Amino acid sequence: HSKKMEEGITVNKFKPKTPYVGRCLLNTKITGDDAPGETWHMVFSHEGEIPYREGQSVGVIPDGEDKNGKPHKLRLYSIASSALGDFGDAKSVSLCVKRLIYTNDAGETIKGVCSNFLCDLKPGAEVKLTGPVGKEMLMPKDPNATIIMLGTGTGIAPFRSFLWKMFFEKHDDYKFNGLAWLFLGVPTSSSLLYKEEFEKMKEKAPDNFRLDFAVSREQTNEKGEKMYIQTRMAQYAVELWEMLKKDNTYFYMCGLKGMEKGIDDIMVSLAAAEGIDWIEYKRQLKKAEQWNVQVY
Numbered sequence: 001h002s003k004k005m006e007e008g009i010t011v012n013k014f015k016p017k018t019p020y021v022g023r024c025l026l027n028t029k030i031t032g033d034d035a036p037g038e039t040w041h042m043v044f045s046h047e048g049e050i051p052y053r054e055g056q057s058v059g060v061i062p063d064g065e066d067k068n069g070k071p072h073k074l075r076l077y078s079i080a081s082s083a084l085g086d087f088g089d090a091k092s093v094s095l096c097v098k099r100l101i102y103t104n105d106a107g108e109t110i111k112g113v114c115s116n117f118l119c120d121l122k123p124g125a126e127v128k129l130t131g132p133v134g135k136e137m138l139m140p141k142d143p144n145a146t147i148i149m150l151g152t153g154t155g156i157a158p159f160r161s162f163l164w165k166m167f168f169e170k171h172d173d174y175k176f177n178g179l180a181w182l183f184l185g186v187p188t189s190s191s192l193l194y195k196e197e198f199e200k201m202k203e204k205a206p207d208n209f210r211l212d213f214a215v216s217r218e219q220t221n222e223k224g225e226k227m228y229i230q231t232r233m234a235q236y237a238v239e240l241w242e243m244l245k246k247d248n249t250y251f252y253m254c255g256l257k258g259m260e261k262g263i264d265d266i267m268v269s270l271a272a273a274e275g276i277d278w279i280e281y282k283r284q285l286k287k288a289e290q291w292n293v294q295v296y
């Protein structure tokens with residue numbers, strides 16, 4: 001019995017040994033120049049061959065071979081488009097990719113393999129895709145559910161997918177009528193991803209959509225602390241904790257591995273204040289499919 005939309009999902013239709021070769025339609029830089037690092041939104045054509053569902057991921061095999069002449073390992077990316085896609089025809093798939101650049105031990109600049117291959121793609125370029133992959137981040141079946149989404153950076157991807165389905169499309173068997181609440185934590189305002197789309201959704205469903213941003217390097221709370229995602233959440237602590245107590249509330253978290261810790265710290269304190277052991281409570285939530293996490 002599942003509380004999530006798992007029925008009839010497709011998994012690994014395409015594999016590393018036999019990937020689907022799609023073509024790049026668009027590749028746009030979506031962060032401003034201020035932004036520490038670039039993030040690109042790219043759309044690939046798949047001609048309806050990849051029947052994915054919101055919350056799933058695809059694997060990308062970047063071109064080239066590793067140091068042993070073998071093809072590169074696949075990298076997973078959460079799909080940033082709903083099942084119908086940015087064009088509404090179920091024939092394209094979109095990714096939100098941050099270009100990874102770091103320095104090794106010798107002080108030499110290293111560019112991450114897949115992220116740079118992807119961010120450098122030009123319209124018309126081919127790309128090997130695998131998947132769909134995943135069940136963890138699927139949407140709840142309940143159209144009247146309270147859905148709380150907490151993402152950092154590219155972690156915004158599966159929530160854009162959820163929200164396009166909920167607020168930008170008309171479906172024959174699905175009409176969202178609950179409360180969706182998105183918290184997006186980025187470092188700078190130039191790093192806010194898809195803000196403009198979320199602003200249009202907010203105007204469209206003002207009573208079904210709540211929106212909060214946390215721009216760490218530009219905002220602080222009363223004590224003067226940096227506005228991290230948990231720093232912005234604590235401001236609604238009483239309300240969120242009360243929401244977690246209800247059976248129709250579903251929590252989803254996606255983004256950088258780090259975010260997990262800072263949210264757990266806020267929660268341990270709220271629960272203890274009520275005589276609840278957060279570790280066991282979180283365990284029960286996870287079993288009930290109400291606490292969903294995908295960090296990397």
Ligand SMILES: Cc1cc2nc3c(=O)[nH]c(=O)nc-3n(C[C@H](O)[C@H](O)[C@H](O)COP(=O)(O)OP(=O)(O)OC[C@H]3O[C@@H](n4cnc5c(N)ncnc54)[C@H](O)[C@@H]3O)c2cc1C
Pocket residue numbers: 057075076077078079096097098100102103104111112113114115116154155157294296
């Ligand atoms: C389920 C899932 C979904 C994902 N969704 C997305 C998504 O939507 N968008 C997205 O951008 N990414 C996403 N990722 C991450 C993505 O899969 C890649 O890991 C990412 O793009 C970097 O891969 P790469 O091939 O560019 O880097 P690689 O060439 O694999 O390099 C990564 C390596 O660089 C090293 N490294 C990184 N930072 C540093 C540093 N500061 N100093 C030293 N060494 C360092 C690490 O050891 C790491 O092993 C997701 C990952 C998972 C598991």
